[PDB]
């Protein structure tokens, strides 16, 4: 999209020295003990994002045994017959935290509050009806 | 006769060529002609033989002038608590190329640490001896089955001894300057301590001044606890034999008598903890001695002064609040009045009446089972005494045993062993005792003149702006200062916080209230 | 003790990163490498030598005037 | 199984010297404070004719010195500890040693103190051609 590729890095964590001094004062973190420090804030260098997106190469085309699949799908469905579903109008959805990111390219002009707050119920129901075709 | 010390364990039957046989009993008998040895040139010296040498039954009770004793008496151990660490080992038997001896496998200390080590033993060669790895197998006992998987998880020994020095060093660097091991099956542990102990004349550290308790083989240098990194030998441990003290069956049944806390998860540290728990019981659950002293490590004298201040203040306040006729003191072995002047009738009780002042100090062992219906006049005062549920009138101050600090050390059974000066042992903490009372809420009562300049009353006494609602010290109205009262309030608040962070909890009869102190104030 | 090494390595990397070192690219890669290696080490000695190799970076620059803080 | 090896009259000495850090000085302090020296050494039988050189392949005494089983004289070889020879084995394991019958009551003490003169091959003082 743009002329130069961005390289994103991941900074290290922050240290709470007072609590560490407390905990060693009360006799923790002994050598050879069982409880210890194993959970840290690992840092990453430049080509971190792409080196993790590359992990999709483990996804390969897979052909399934169609008959046994057509049976187990029925059994799985039977595991799921105590609930109730169906479409609902725009004026019945429940959004917790209307203040998260709105993906791209919409994140150039505000959070999800904007788009959930600038489209009347008619526009939302019209969008649903549109994607139904 | 013979002993088992250095008892060979090789399977070959032929004796050794006299020139390579360590003793006159481990030679072969063709050379044995009338107790003497004769070289028979018809046979030569072997050039390949690997005889394991068992290392049990060491028996060390010598008297040399430069060297310190390794087994200490009971009193020399009572003095040096803070430094006790349990110890237990698990074994394994030798298999193919030898049989008849045990090798250390799992080690366990009073701390909950468990180290496993590959089986190694002392082998001979036609040129020298050798510390090498040997094959082994667990004991055929069924309960020892939790040892089968461990035989492939070992560590080379040098790693193990470094880890041991380091664990000890950061367990004890702030408490003692030595270490005394409490142990049970004395023999096998003494056998195991060949791997990482070295004894010798007393020495002082390098680049520090305290006595040295570490040894490094590479650099050949000693160290204290603080400056000991990379060193791998304990230089002068001390020991103790608990079972020596007149005990009968296994320590399991013996410990099971009192402490119902320490169960037995099947390891070695469990045995270590049980041994130390028992040793603490045998010497400390009795009555507290006043002749034993301990050094301060450290800051303690602040806690003591704070306890003084808070005792004085709280008792004075309770008296002036309710004006009790008689003050039923309890648990005071020295008839010393806490508040110095108090018209109230002042008793003294104890379960240990001294010689003098016994006429004052009536013998009394309190228990709510019986004396519950006896002292229903005035109010008691259980300063640091330890009974069961207290009577609905009292002013108890009892040390919580759940807190963590380097002052109180784990004891039995769940109750911990405080150590300030003379070691106090307190029973386990529980709520059922205080079912009649309520936590004393903080306050500060003063009763004296004020700043000065004015030295009269409203309103010429110096005011600064302290706004707090609990310093009940008329003169006080919101500006509430009279300097004196103000910085005194600051000091006493600091002291109260330090005391109650050290571990002590307070309680008062349910009838208490602060307002009547104000009512006293109106003059 | 080893925990102290891990902890001071965390703090050191934080200081480096806030001294804009991540602007340069190969240097930041090396610093991140050493930090993540120290956090997973098992024995103290090699952790100490990685620690000195990584501190050499901060010493090689003139942004922090150590002659000030080394006053005790 | 196995075969016993030490008589009960050696337990304290052997333990206290197998735990020490300087086995030599430890043993010297042991003796110097009223100790009973080590004593189930192997004793030889020969002609008391030959070189005075103690260190030998075959018992070669004179009328005065006394042949002993070498390996059972190196304290290091006796307590089963490592040797201070920089590399790397005891030498007395394999040979015979001959000690002046006077001091040849304590073999290990002598072996620790005295030494053979490289030239005369005999003990420095019992005797030596050098000077
Ligand atoms: Mg067990
Ligand atoms: Mg056990
Ligand atoms: Zn030191
Ligand atoms: Zn030798
Ligand atoms: Zn010579």
Spell out which residues of chain C touch residue B167, defining contact as CB-CB under 8 Å: none
Q: Which ligand does the CA of B222 lie closest to?
A: 3
Q: Provide CB contacts within 8 A for A86, sequence distance 6+.
A: none
Beta strands at B508-509 and B221-223: parallel, antiparallel or unpaired: unpaired
Q: What is the resolution of this structure in A?
A: 3.3
Alpha helices in C1-72 (DSSP H): 2-18, 26-38, 44-59, 66-69
SS3 B439: coil
Of C1, C44, C45, the CB nearest to B170: C1
Burial of residue D74 (number of CB atoms within 10 Å: 0-12, 13-18, 19+): buried
* Residue linked to tokens 């205080």: B434
Does the annotation place B224 within a ligand binding site?
yes
Torsion sign across C-alpha atoms B163, B164, B168, B173 = negative
Contact residues, D window 13-52, toward B, CB-based 8 Å cutoff: 13-16, 18-22, 26, 29-30, 33, 40-45
Among all residues of chain A, which has the CA nearest to that of B107? A32
What's the domain range around D45? 1-131
Q: How far is D128 from chain B (nearest CA, A)?
A: 25
Q: How far lies B490's CA from each of B442, B461, B463, D65, D128, in Å?
A: 13, 19, 15, 89, 88
Q: How many domains does chain C have?
A: 1
Q: How far lies B148's CA from each of B40, B64, B115, B138, in Å?
A: 48, 44, 15, 7
Of A26, A27, A30, the CB nearest to B167: A30
Angle at the Cα of A91 (from A90 to A97), degrees rounded to 5? 90
Spell out which residues of chain B touch residue A30, defining contact as CB-CB under 8 Å: 111, 113, 167, 170-171
Burial of residue B112 (number of CB atoms within 10 Å: 0-12, 13-18, 19+): middle
Q: Provide CB contacts within 8 A for A132, sequence distance 6+.
A: none
DSSP B330: E
**Pairwise CA distance, residues B268 & B69, whole Å:** 27
Q: Do chains A and C touch (3 or more CB pairs under 8 A)?
A: yes
Does the annotation place B277 within a ligand binding site?
yes
Burial of residue B182 (number of CB atoms within 10 Å: 0-12, 13-18, 19+): buried
Q: How far lies B269's CA from each of B257, B385, C23, in Å?
A: 20, 33, 52
Catalytic residue IDs of B: 88, 90, 189, 266, 271
Chains contacting chain C through 3 or more C-beta pairs under 8 A: A, B
| Phi, psi values for residue B512, rounded to 5° | -65, 150
CA dihedral defined by B201, B207, B211, B216, rounded to 10 degrees?
Answer: -50
Give the largest CA-CA distance in chain B.
121
SS3 B203: coil
Which of B228, B330, B322 shows the shortest CA–CA distance to B511? B322
Q: How many domains does chain D have?
A: 1
Beta strands at B444-445 and B471-472: parallel, antiparallel or unpaired: parallel
Torsion sign across C-alpha atoms D4, D5, D11, D16 = negative
SS3 D70: coil
Does the annotation place D46 within a ligand binding site?
no
SS3 B90: strand
- Among B9, B18, B235, B236, most D C-beta atoms within 10 A, so best to mutate, is B18
Q: How far lies B309's CA from each of B7, B144, B300, B338, in Å?
A: 67, 57, 15, 10
CB B418 within 8 A of CB B407: yes
Peptide bond into D65 cis (omega under 30): no
Beta strands at B120-124 and B129-133: parallel, antiparallel or unpaired: antiparallel
Q: Provide CB contacts within 8 A for B99, sequence distance 6+.
A: B9, B11, B93, D1
* Residue linked to tokens 């579903």: A85
What's the domain range around C65? 1-72
- Tell me the count of B-C CB pairs closer than 8 A: 5
- Tell me the count of A-B CB pairs closer than 8 A: 27
SS3 C66: helix
């Amino acid at each position: 999209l743009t002329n130069n590729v961005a390289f994103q890095t991941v900074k290290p964590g922050n240290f709470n020295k007072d609590f560490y001094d407390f905990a060693v004062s009360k006799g923790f973190f002994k050598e050879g003990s069982s409880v210890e420090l194993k959970h840290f804030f690992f840092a990453q260098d430049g080509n971190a994002a792409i080196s993790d997106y590359d992990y999709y190469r483990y996804n390969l085309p897979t052909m399934c045994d169609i008959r046994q699949l057509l049976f187990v799908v029925e059994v799985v469905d039977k595991y799921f017959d105590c609930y109730d579903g169906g479409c609902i109008n725009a004026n019945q959805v429940i959004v917790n935290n209307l203040d998260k990111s709105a993906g791209f390219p919409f994140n150039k002009w505000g959070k999800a509050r904007l788009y959930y707050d600038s489209m009347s119920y008619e526009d939302q129901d019209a969008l649903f009806a549109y994607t139904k075709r | 006769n013979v002993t088992g010390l250095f008892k060979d364990c090789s399977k070959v039957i032929t004796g050794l060529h006299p020139t390579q046989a360590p003793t006159h009993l481990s030679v072969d008998t063709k050379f044995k002609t009338e107790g003497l040895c004769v070289d028979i040139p018809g046979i030569p010296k072997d050039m390949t033989y690997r005889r394991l040498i068992s290392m049990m039954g060491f028996k060390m009770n010598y008297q040399v002038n430069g060297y310190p004793n390794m087994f200490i008496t009971r009193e020399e151990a009572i003095r040096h608590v803070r430094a006790w660490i349990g110890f237990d080992v698990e074994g394994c038997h030798a298999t193919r190329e030898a049989v008849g001896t045990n090798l250390p496998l799992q080690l366990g200390f009073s701390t909950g640490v468990n180290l496993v080590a590959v089986p190694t033993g002392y082998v001979d060669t036609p040129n020298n001896t050798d510390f090498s790895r040997v094959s082994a197998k667990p004991p055929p006992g069924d309960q020892f089955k939790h040892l089968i998987p461990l035989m492939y998880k070992g560590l080379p020994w040098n790693v193990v001894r470094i880890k041991i020095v380091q664990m000890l060093s950061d367990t004890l660097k702030n408490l003692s300057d030595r270490v005394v091991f409490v142990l049970w099956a004395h023999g096998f542990e003494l056998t195991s301590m060949k791997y990482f102990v070295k004894i010798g004349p007393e020495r002082t550290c390098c680049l520090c001044d305290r006595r040295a308790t570490c040894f490094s083989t590479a650099s050949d240098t000693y160290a204290c606890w603080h400056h000991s990194i990379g060193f791998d030998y304990v230089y002068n441990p001390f020991m103790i034999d608990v079972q020596q003290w007149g005990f009968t069956g296994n320590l399991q049944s013996n410990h099971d008598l009192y402490c119902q806390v320490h169960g037995n998860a099947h390891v070695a540290s469990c045995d270590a903890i049980m041994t130390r728990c028992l040793a603490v019981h045998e010497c400390f659950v009795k009555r507290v001695d006043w002749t034993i002293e301990y050094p301060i490590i450290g800051d303690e004298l602040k806690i003591n002064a704070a306890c003084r201040k808070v005792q004085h203040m709280v008792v004075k306040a309770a008296l002036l609040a309710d004006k009790f006729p008689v003050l039923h003191d309890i648990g005071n072995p020295k008839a010393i009045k806490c508040v110095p002047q108090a018209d109230v009738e002042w008793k003294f009780y104890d379960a240990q009446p001294c010689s003098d002042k016994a006429y004052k100090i009536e013998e009394l062992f309190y228990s709510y089972a019986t004396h519950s219906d006896k002292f229903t006049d005035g109010v008691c005062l259980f300063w640091n005494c330890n009974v069961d549920r207290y009577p609905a009138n009292s002013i108890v101050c009892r040390f919580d045993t759940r807190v963590l600090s380097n002052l109180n050390l784990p004891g039995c059974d769940g109750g911990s062993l405080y150590v300030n000066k003379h070691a106090f042992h307190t029973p386990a903490f529980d709520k059922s005792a205080f079912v009649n009372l309520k936590q004393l809420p903080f306050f500060y009562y003063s009763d004296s003149p004020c700043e000065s300049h004015g030295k009269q009353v409203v309103s010429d006494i110096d005011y600064v702006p302290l706004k707090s609602a609990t310093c009940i010290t008329r003169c006080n109205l919101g500006g509430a200062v009279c300097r004196h009262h103000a910085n005194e309030y600051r000091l006493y608040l600091d002291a109260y916080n330090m005391m109650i962070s050290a571990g002590f909890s307070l309680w008062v009869y349910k009838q208490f209230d602060t307002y009547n102190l104000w009512n006293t104030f109106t003059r | 003790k080893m925990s102290d090494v891990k902890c001071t390595s965390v703090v050191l990397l934080s200081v480096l990163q806030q001294l804009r070192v991540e602007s340069s690219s190969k240097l930041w890669a090396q610093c991140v490498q050493l930090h993540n290696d120290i956090l997973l080490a098992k024995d103290t000695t090699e952790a100490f030598e990685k620690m000195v190799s990584l501190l050499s970076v901060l010493l090689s620059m003139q942004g922090a005037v150590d002659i000030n803080k080394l006053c005790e | 199984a196995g075969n016993a090896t030490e008589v009960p009259a050696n337990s304290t000495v052997l333990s206290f010297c197998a735990f020490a850090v300087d086995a030599a000085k430890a043993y010297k302090d042991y003796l110097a404070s009223g100790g009973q020296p080590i004593t189930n050494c192997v004793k030889m039988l020969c002609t008391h004719t030959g070189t005075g050189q103690a260190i030998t392949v075959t018992p070669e005494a004179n009328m005065d010195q006394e042949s002993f089983g070498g390996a059972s004289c190196c304290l290091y070889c006796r307590c089963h500890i490592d040797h201070p020879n920089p590399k790397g084995f005891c030498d007395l394991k394999g040979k015979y040693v001959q000690i002046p019958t006077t001091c040849a009551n304590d073999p290990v003490g002598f072996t620790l103190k005295n030494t053979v003169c490289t030239v005369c091959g005999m003990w420095k003082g019992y005797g030596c051609s050098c000077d």
